[PDB]
Amino acid sequence: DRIITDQLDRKVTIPDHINRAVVLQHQTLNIAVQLDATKQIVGVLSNWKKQLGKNYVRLAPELENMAMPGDLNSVNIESLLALKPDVVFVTNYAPSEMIKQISDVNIPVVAISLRTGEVGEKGKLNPTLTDEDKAYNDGLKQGIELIAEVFEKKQQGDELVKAAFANRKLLADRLGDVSADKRVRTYMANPDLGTYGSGKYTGLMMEHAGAYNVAAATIKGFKQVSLENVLEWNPAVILVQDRYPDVVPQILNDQGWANIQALKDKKVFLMPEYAKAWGYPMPEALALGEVWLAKALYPQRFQDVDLDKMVNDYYQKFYRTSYKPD
Ligand code: MOO
Structure with a gap:
């Protein structure tokens, strides 16, 4: 196994390889698509077409028949378990009750905010940030790096960070x-x-x-x-x-x-x-x-x-x- 630190500063133990990730956040989904990681995903947030736009499916047609066992702030544990996931990515402000539902059935959870910033704000939908430029710059880079490490896409992750900036x-x-x-x-x-x-x-x-x-x-x-x-x-x-x-x-x-x-x-x-x-x-x-x-x-x-x-x-x-x- 591997230990990572997610964007809520949680230490998370995950398998050495990921092939059955469930991605309950559109931002991380769009990153994973750009890391060419979608063959390693087996469910996505149920509001993906709304949050990514109706034409997103053009860039990732494989999303169309993807299972949807939760969304940004809710999860359906009985649907999620049938997918046999090996990790769930959630958004940083996912309610503690939702993260606890998934941790209680022993599935690793990795929270993504694409922001550093003040620690007390990391879990907040709408943060107060004393240097939002730095927090988002460093957070996009740290986030991309983390998603790429989970999917073992390090080199494409590094190229994606360099392209972003x-x-x-x-x-x-x-x-x-x-x-x-x-x-x-x-x-x-x-x-x-x-x-x-x-x-x-x-x-x-x-x-x-x-x-x-x-x-x-x-x-x-x-x-x-x-x-x-x-x-x-x-x-x-x-x-x-x-x-x-x-x-x-x-x-x-x-x-x-x-x-x-x-x-x-x-x-x-x-x-x-x-x-x-x-x-x-x-x-x-x-x-x-x-x-x-x-x-x-x-x-x-x-x-x-x-x-x-x-x-x-x-x-x-x-x-x-x-x-x-x-
Ligand atoms: O889709 Mo948002 O505007 O990044 O929360």
Whole structure:
């Protein structure tokens, strides 16, 4: 057996090889797909299509007939035992009762947060972080490393970490003169007036591409806000996650939103599939997503940056297919 330390700082003993993992978190699932580890998985969170988007199955068709013995915050132990799993990956904020259900039937559990940060916050859905940039940078690298070790994908893990961060220098250099008063005020609109505030990767993706998350000063993590909040914030640009494409026509056809600066300016954009401004960092969101948003908002600073090729090279390497725009 092997002992690892997971992202809740739990020491976990696992078999020397894993071939029957159950992955109850979409972030770790997308990593495992990019580590070419799916033949070693036999169940996944039951809300995988919602959380990954309806087109995710294109990149991992093997997910379609995958068993679903739990989701992010619940598990069905009788369904889970029939799969004969050798490990379950859970999200960092999985309730203690759920982790205990799985530990009580002697199946190892590995909690993934993709964040370091303050120890007392490691289990919290919406953390308070004194250095969120460092916590998410180091946490994405530590997380990818951990998932790759469990699946014995070390070399591809190392390549995935190096790819995630390969463009950060370009953006730091090209956008280093953007002052706080000029940074582009941007808002992430999720279904049902949901947004992300502080302690999340969303605002980091915006910062690295010369923008600022208008909600992050007053909202903590992922919350439902009111229409009045968004009118007050009056963002210049509204972004929608690719997995929730219905949110764009919703906003565009909603008279209550019409006087917001982004509406008036026709700056309501569905982000690409790779450009995940999610509450958790994903390697493609750093590598490709931040470059997309930087080019969208400062096109005249990036004309030499062939993003189509960057995206193709990345997709052929980690998803073993081309990118397909929707
Ligand atoms: O799907 Mo998330 O919780 O926005 O990373």
